[PDB]
Amino acid sequence: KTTMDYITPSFKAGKPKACYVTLVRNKELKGLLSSIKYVENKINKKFPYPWVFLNDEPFTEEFKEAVTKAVSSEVKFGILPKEHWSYPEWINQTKAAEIRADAATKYIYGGSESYRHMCRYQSGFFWRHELLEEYDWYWRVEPDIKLYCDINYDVFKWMQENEKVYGFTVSIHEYEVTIPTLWQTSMDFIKKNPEYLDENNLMSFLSNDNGKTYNLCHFWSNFEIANLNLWRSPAYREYFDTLDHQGGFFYERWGDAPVHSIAAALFLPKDKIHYFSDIGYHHPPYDNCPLDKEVYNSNNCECDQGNDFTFQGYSCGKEYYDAQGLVKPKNWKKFRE
Amino acid sequence: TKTTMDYITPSFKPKACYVTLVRNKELKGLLSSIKYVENKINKKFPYPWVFLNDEPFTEEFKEAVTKAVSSEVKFGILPKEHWSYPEWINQTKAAEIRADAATKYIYGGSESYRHMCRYQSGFFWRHELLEEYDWYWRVEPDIKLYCDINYDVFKWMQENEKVYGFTVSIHEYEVTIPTLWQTSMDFIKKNPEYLDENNLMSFLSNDNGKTYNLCHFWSNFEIANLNLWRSPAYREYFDTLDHQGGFFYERWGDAPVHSIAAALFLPKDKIHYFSDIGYHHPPYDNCPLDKEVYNSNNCECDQGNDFTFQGYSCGKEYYDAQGLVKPKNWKKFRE
Numbered sequence: 001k002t003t004m005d006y007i008t009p010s011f012k013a014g015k016p017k018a019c020y021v022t023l024v025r026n027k028e029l030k031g032l033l034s035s036i037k038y039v040e041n042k043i044n045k046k047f048p049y050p051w052v053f054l055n056d057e058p059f060t061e062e063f064k065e066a067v068t069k070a071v072s073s074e075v076k077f078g079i080l081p082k083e084h085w086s087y088p089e090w091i092n093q094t095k096a097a098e099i100r101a102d103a104a105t106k107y108i109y110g111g112s113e114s115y116r117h118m119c120r121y122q123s124g125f126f127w128r129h130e131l132l133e134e135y136d137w138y139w140r141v142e143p144d145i146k147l148y149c150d151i152n153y154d155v156f157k158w159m160q161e162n163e164k165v166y167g168f169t170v171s172i173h174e175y176e177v178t179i180p181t182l183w184q185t186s187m188d189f190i191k192k193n194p195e196y197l198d199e200n201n202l203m204s205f206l207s208n209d210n211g212k213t214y215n216l217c218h219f220w221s222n223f224e225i226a227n228l229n230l231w232r233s234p235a236y237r238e239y240f241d242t243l244d245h246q247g248g249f250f251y252e253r254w255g256d257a258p259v260h261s262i263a264a265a266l267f268l269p270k271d272k273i274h275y276f277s278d279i280g281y282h283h284p285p286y287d288n289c290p291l292d293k294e295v296y297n298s299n300n301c302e303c304d305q306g307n308d309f310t311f312q313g314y315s316c317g318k319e320y321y322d323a324q325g326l327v328k329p330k331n332w333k334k335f336r337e
Numbered sequence: 338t339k340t341t342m343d344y345i346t347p348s349f350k351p352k353a354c355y356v357t358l359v360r361n362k363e364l365k366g367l368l369s370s371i372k373y374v375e376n377k378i379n380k381k382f383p384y385p386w387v388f389l390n391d392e393p394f395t396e397e398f399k400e401a402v403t404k405a406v407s408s409e410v411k412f413g414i415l416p417k418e419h420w421s422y423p424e425w426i427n428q429t430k431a432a433e434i435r436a437d438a439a440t441k442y443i444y445g446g447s448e449s450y451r452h453m454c455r456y457q458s459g460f461f462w463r464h465e466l467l468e469e470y471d472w473y474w475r476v477e478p479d480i481k482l483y484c485d486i487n488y489d490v491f492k493w494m495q496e497n498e499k500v501y502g503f504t505v506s507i508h509e510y511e512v513t514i515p516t517l518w519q520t521s522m523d524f525i526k527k528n529p530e531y532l533d534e535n536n537l538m539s540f541l542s543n544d545n546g547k548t549y550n551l552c553h554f555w556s557n558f559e560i561a562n563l564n565l566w567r568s569p570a571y572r573e574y575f576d577t578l579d580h581q582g583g584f585f586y587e588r589w590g591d592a593p594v595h596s597i598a599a600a601l602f603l604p605k606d607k608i609h610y611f612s613d614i615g616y617h618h619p620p621y622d623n624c625p626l627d628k629e630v631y632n633s634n635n636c637e638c639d640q641g642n643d644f645t646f647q648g649y650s651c652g653k654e655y656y657d658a659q660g661l662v663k664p665k666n667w668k669k670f671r672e
């Protein structure tokens with residue numbers, strides 16, 4: 001019983017069991033309300049789906065009232081378990097503390113204790129919160145996001161019909177100083193569990209040397225429309241557990257983005273991964289802006305196509321297209337000027 | 338002997354302008370920025386807006402811009418000599434450096450980005466259209482002004498005799514400027530007269546100049562006196578940088594370049610942090626922490642997202658350098 005065996009059951013032509021999901025703090029109400037406006041205007045009014053909001057602290061009454069008014073579909077508020085937002089018993093907190101203090105000015109969120117709990121949460125726990133149990137699909141939405149174009153079709157229905165497992169917009173190279181031992185830990189896991197490496201994996205996106213080293217490319221997780229059953233699979237559960245035991249979420253600053261990406265690219269047949277070239281999106285500081293004129297004009301996009309990050313050198317659109325055998329847009333090189 | 342400040346004090350309505358370097362492909366982001374500037378300060382305190390571009394502007398672009406801006410607008414194209422390889426830079430070596438760094442750091446493989454950094458460092462302040470002004474306010478596309486600004490900022494700078502004003506500060510990625518600090522210190526060693534006796538070196542270094550802590554003012558937002566850049570100290574500093582080759586052999590940004598100059602060549606009380614101006618340039622915010630300022634100016638940002646005192650920001654280093662008292666809850670930004 002393979003990884004795909006846990007996922008294919010979610011592929012009848014009924015309405016998919018899906019939700020939007022947001023991990024946010026009370027101090028981010030204004031940015032969150034702004035993201036809701038985009039989601040509501042660009043797609044939720046047309047194809048309504050429940051929205052789940054999670055917080056490590058309780059939501060204020062003002063926050064809930066404001067969100068309930070802004071969202072036209074059903075909203076659900078949940079707080080996460082202490083066990084999913086605390087140091088595991090095997091982690092040396094004095095050591096973690098030293099690492100943070102030392103890295104405070106060395107890289108973004110280097111000195112942040114809470115950022116690491118967030119990365120660990122998005123890597124191994126959000127997908128098993130009680131509020132997501134009844135769903136097969138989720139669409140992660142962060143605060144301060146923009147949806148630049150109309151989306152005139154149900155995306156969850158589309159993923160279900162086309163049997164896609166993981167969908168993304170932006171991709172980028174990670175700062176290695178943030179994940180020095182993530183690749184080694186991940187490669188050791190594969191060597192130990194060969195059955196988990198899909199024979200038609202997307203290793204080419206993650207590495208230029210057949211897996212010897214990581215090229216640092218990953219899908220930018222702030223935007224994800226994927227199948228919850230991937231994370232619930234034995235393969236991923238065991239992968240997370242291994243990472244959790246190694247200590248990188250706290251001894252380094254492992255993000256959930258490279259973690260989710262390494263898993264998706266290695267545990268799935270590559271044709272289960274999908275790039276939404278048609279969804280206009282902005283998460284500071286990068287844009288995904290539809291390059292196709294018809295798609296751009298038909299969906300009234302509000303972005304500057306020339307600012308699409310996809311084919312910029314530091315993005316990983318080129319690596320993704322080549323690994324998937326996708327034909328790149330004619331003027332893709334213009335983005336490398 | 339005339340000093341750096343002697344070139345600036347005579348400039349103390351001000352002859353000021355907004356200035357933007359933009360490409361035709363960023364029209365929607367620019368119009369958005371314009372709407373913000375108009376709504377938060379320009380209709381109340383109008384000042385001319387200068388738009389620069391290394392290529393000619395499209396008619397559609399100019400038309401849209403002319404009508405979106407309430408004050409006078411001016412369009413200018415950049416001199417070819419302010420946007421091309423100087424004759425002493427080895428282009429194949431630069432080409433190799435770019436091809437190599439392409440996937441290594443943001444803009445690593447970009448040729449245009451380097452000409453842009455070099456332009457903001459040594460040439461925008463000498464463009465024909467800026468000659469008549471003493472002050473400028475740099476505005477980039479895709480910006481937000483979160484709050485109303487109820488005073489004329491240029492006038493304020495003038496009356497308070499401030500030379501360089503900023504909002505966001507950050508630590509630079511060292512891989513883009515490996516030899517910038519040594520080059521700058523060698524310049525100061527050879528030109529001790531340009532180092533102001535009461536400078537802000539402590540903002541740039543934790544060890545009195547031995548090493549660069551990488552802190553810099555984020556140049557996307559600047560309200561300053563053009564006479565600092567037109568001073569002999571800066572002209573000679575930029576020329577030294579230009580001949581060293583870092584704009585092309587590394588990836589020297591104008592932000593650290595402007596910052597090193599401002600922090601070493603001026604008395605520190607000539608630098609000013611606008612704690613009251615709400616601003617966003619992807620992906621960092623400056624959101625007024627003071628309650629009265631926030632409410633009175635109808636700010637639209639999340640205060641808890643203010644970048645100023647976050648670890649990777651240089652707000653702490655800045656306040657400490659100027660002897661400014663940090664807000665009581667500054668540590669919460671480091672959680």
Ligand SMILES: *[C@@H]1O[C@H](CO)[C@@H](O[C@@H]2O[C@H](CO)[C@@H](O[C@@H]3O[C@H](CO[C@H]4O[C@H](CO[C@H]5O[C@H](CO)[C@@H](O)[C@H](O)[C@@H]5O)[C@@H](O)[C@H](O[C@H]5O[C@H](CO)[C@@H](O)[C@H](O)[C@@H]5O)[C@@H]4O)[C@@H](O)[C@H](O[C@H]4O[C@H](CO)[C@@H](O)[C@H](O)[C@@H]4O[C@H]4O[C@H](CO)[C@@H](O)[C@H](O)[C@@H]4O)[C@@H]3O)[C@H](O)[C@H]2NC(C)=O)[C@H](O)[C@H]1NC(C)=O
Binds near residue numbers: 092094095098102
């Ligand atoms: C959980 O994690 C914690 C945290 O890491 C573990 O504790 C740490 O354990 C390591 C061992 O693995 C200890 O290392 C030894 O450190 C001493 C020096 O100790 C001083 O410096 C420390 C480092 O300072 C830097 O970092 C801090 C903060 O990050 C900065 O502020 C500084 O500026 C520095 O950058 C510092 O942390 C220590 O502070 C502690 O003690 C002081 C009092 O002294 C207190 O005020 C503090 O609050 C705090 O309590 C301290 O100041 C080294 O000397 C040791 O090196 C010897 O051994 C090495 C090999 O083992 C060898 O390579 C060295 O050369 C050296 O050996 C020499 O001497 C030998 C004996 O004579 C000779 O035989 C040999 O030939 C050679 O000549 C060693 O590196 C940490 O100190 C310790 N930290 C703390 C806070 O306890 C903890 O073990 C983990 N818990 C578990 C269950 O695993």
Ligand SMILES: *[C@@H]1O[C@H](CO)[C@@H](O[C@H]2O[C@H](CO)[C@@H](O)[C@H](O)[C@H]2NC(C)=O)[C@H](O)[C@H]1NC(C)=O
Binds near residue numbers: 433
């Ligand atoms: C300009 O830069 C190029 C590229 O670095 C130099 O080309 C040489 O570089 C190496 C010698 O140091 C060797 O690889 C070759 O001799 C040659 N390589 C190339 C690019 O073909 C070149 O010498 C530099 N020119 C000057 C005047 O220094």
Ligand SMILES: [Cl-]
Binds near residue numbers: 109112649
């Ligand atoms: Cl930070």
Ligand SMILES: [Cl-]
Binds near residue numbers: 312314439442445446
């Ligand atoms: Cl790039």
